[PDB]
Amino acid sequence: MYAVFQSGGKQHRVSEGQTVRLEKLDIATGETVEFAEVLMIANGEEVKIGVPFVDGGVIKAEVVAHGRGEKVKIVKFRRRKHYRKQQGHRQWFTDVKITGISA
Amino acid sequence: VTGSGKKPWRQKGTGRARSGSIKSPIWRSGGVTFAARPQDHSQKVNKKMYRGALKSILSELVRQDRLIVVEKFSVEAPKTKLLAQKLKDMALEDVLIITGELDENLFLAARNLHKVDVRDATGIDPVSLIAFDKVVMTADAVKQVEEMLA
Amino acid sequence: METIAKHRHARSSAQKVRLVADLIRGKKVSQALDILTYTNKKAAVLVKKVLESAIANAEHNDGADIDDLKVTKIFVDEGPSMKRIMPRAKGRADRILKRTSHITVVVSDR
Amino acid sequence: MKTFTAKPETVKRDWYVVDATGKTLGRLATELARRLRGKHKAEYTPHVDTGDYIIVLNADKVAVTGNKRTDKVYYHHTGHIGGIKQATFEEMIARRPERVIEIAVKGMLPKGPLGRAMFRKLKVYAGNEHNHAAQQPQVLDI
Amino acid sequence: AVQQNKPTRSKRGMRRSHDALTAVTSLSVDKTSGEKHLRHHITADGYYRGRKVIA
Amino acid sequence: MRLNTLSPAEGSKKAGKRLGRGIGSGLGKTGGRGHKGQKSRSGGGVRR
Amino acid sequence: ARVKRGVIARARHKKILKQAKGYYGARSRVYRVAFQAVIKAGQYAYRDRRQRKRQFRQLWIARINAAARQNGISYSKFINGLKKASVEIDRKILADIAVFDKVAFTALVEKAKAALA
RNA sequence: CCCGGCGAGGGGAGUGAAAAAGAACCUGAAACCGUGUACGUACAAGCAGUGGGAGCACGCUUAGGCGUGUGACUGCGUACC
RNA sequence: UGUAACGGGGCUAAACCAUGCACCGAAGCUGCGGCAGCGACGCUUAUGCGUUGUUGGGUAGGGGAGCGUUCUGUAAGCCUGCGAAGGUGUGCUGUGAGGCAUGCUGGAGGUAUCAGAAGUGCGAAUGCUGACAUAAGUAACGAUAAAGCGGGUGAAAAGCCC
């Protein structure tokens, strides 16, 4: 019942109804992002693999939020050469609720 | 530092650190490395810099409408309730009152008032002009600061 | 009821007193008092004095029932260590510490 | 989503019988090590012992190529003054017949607790009998 | 003879684990006194197996 | 204006250098003087 | 104007000891050894971000190799057939299907075997 | 008032707004020493972490799972100046 | 010193040579997401806004830009005994020094913004002062002239009195 698609240069294997967190999409919250770039559609044992952007089937998702992740800290340090550097980072993301698996 | 000129131990042989005197700023009860001194921090401004700065301050005070001009500021009695009354009439809680002749009858009844300073036309300083919430001067003092600055 | 009783600045080490303090942690109070009676340690005498003070305070300051009582919580902590000076050979001194300790016992019915 | 990992209480295992007659020691031990680690199952995670149980019959018929019957030496040190012992291969066929396969598979496993468990899965027997008939070992062929 | 670097609370606690004083098992109850004493020692008041030996 | 609004012109103050304050200030731990030598010592240096 | 630097040194040391909450021994209590442990943990986190991005790919490769060899084709010819049939499913999803559903993985084995010979 | 040596020290009562303000007396840190609870630990080798991570423990909860603590097992990894 | 001259297992190929094709393999490169600098380009130059290319390992060092601490002006104003500073947690927040909110302890001070002056920022100096660790409940208890018993005193007697 799961569809394999590509969102942010990387793949996700989503199922119907569940939510996935992926890359930042310049899309308002109460909207719907469509992915026709599905790579595999599996339902039952009737599977559909194809030469990519396979045929017909699509994914219809509704964006939930745009939160940042937990702060990763990056420390560079060279032993006894008088150099250390500290740098935080927080990556944006986007929560989508997959609500449609086509043919 | 009140102390002696003697090493607290030998230079070599004792396992402690080297030490030359008990007055050095590393030690406790001995001190300041770079000692401060009696000095003077007053710094110079030109006559033309101070004059142009006062001109800029007075012109900005007019362009913020805090500068009020009256012809004569007159109280006859040195009682401070009278000056408090005359500033109650003109809605002035906190002023700087420049006069051209420092008559003593207004310097008297302003000393117990905090928010009121009464100075002379020659006694104009920048931070007290900027500091007070209103600045009033007699028009006689307006002419006198016209003659002194320009 | 907690019924705490303590003895502060007990002039002995904290560790040696702690050794016999680990004996009576979790006993009925009669077995504890007899086992502190028949120990060959000075710290047993100290903790026996503190234990009779705690039992007497639990029976006095509140009601009764010595036979119900159980030592829940005993602990010894280190107290203010006082200093002396021990003179040693070739002129070097040694600062030695006479150590004191706090003994505390807490008995209850449950 | 994360990747899949095998939880150790979920693992099923199979029981196997290997006939070592005339199959060479290194290639047989290679297939036993590959089956022992669990690299034949898709549910492999490297921190979980997943590989099957393995029983070996005919452990003294296993042959080596070339002149390795008389020249391969299995050193070990006793941890003493300079008493370092050894044995040849056919002396290990005579004396400790299963230990040739035991050392040869122990050399090809990771070194740690988990390697020790997957080496515990190995049940070598020199005789053609086995007492694990109550475990139902099926047959796999290298 | 001098130590090399200082051990931890664990290596002190492991060595201090073996200093656990065990108690006596149980005191004997006297026949005639009813008082507690050690095995094969006289009581605190002097009776021992029903025989007032020190009075 | 009030007395808490007078700001200097941009580029007036430079706030100076504080030698010996760590890795982050750049200078610090020898404070610009480099390593050993006559130019590194307290009161060191040649004459005119 | 004398500044007493006690409160700010306390803040600076608590800022370290809150980060090193959980290390063994005096790396949790002593400020100096906790400082060395904190910067060493930072370097290890950097290097292990890179090491995770390698290790997980090698795990998916091992899973795909096992699930393919169970189905009758080795891994290298599996990826050669998957590229000459032009399927761009990367190895994370292939390992995920190879663990979960053997049916679609067997279909992919059939497609790769047909694309190869 | 009570334990205790007509001790020290403590438990009560009382004063006080406060006695974990009681004369070692405002606040009361860290190193150090403990007591209890949760988890790990008695066939496993090393700058003691980090990336992955099972199980258990409490909390909740859109009942899916999350959160915090422990972290068996594992790849990498020879402190600071 | 222990095999000990493939890293080991082991390999008659899992060795060597030749041709060839797959595949793995780095922080390289591509992809997606974000930050900053520089060069040009134009929008009307709050010397910003945009489009584009390009760059970003760094010691000695050179340059630019910031955070925080004490005191002064703003401040006889603001917060505050329906709870300040300090202490201790927790949770949000920034690229970083850091900040903000708040539980509990505390029991009367702190101070926005923008400026100004600095005894302005510690891990090391066989640094100084204080507290406390480790070795450790380890060595030792200071002449190998020697103690034993009974009675006393006291809560307790090898050491005190007889």
Side-chain angles (χ1 to χ4, degrees), chain A residues 34-99:
Chain A
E34 306 197 353
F35 313 103
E37 54 272 17
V38 304
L39 270 71
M40 173 187 148
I41 298 147
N43 289 274
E45 74 163 59
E46 301 265 32
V47 80
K48 279 192 69 171
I49 320 161
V51 178
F53 312 105
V54 286
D55 205 7
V58 288
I59 286 177
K60 305 276 209 271
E62 310 192 341
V63 178
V64 194
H66 285 275
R68 286 185 170 184
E70 50 193 329
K71 168 184 274 290
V72 291
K73 178 165 282 287
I74 290 93
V75 177
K76 298 176 196 175
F77 192 62
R78 198 76 44 183
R79 320 178 68 186
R80 88 187 49 88
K81 318 289 193 190
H82 202 215
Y83 151 69
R84 66 165 160 271
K85 188 182 304 186
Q86 192 169 198
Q87 195 156 0
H89 180 257
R90 271 163 72 83
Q91 180 70 23
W92 289 79
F93 51 77
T94 289
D95 288 331
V96 287
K97 194 87 150 180
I98 308 293
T99 54

Side-chain angles (χ1 to χ4, degrees), chain C residues 4 31 35 42-43 49 52 72 80:
Chain C
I4 180 155
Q31 212 169 67
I35 214 70
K42 176 174 69 62
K49 184 161 298 195
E52 285 185 354
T72 77

Side-chain angles (χ1 to χ4, degrees), chain F residues 4 9 13-14 20 22-23 34 37-38 47-48:
Chain F
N4 56 284
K13 311 300 184 70
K14 198 99 155 186
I23 316 175
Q38 213 182 8
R47 73 174 187 256
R48 279 181 312 178

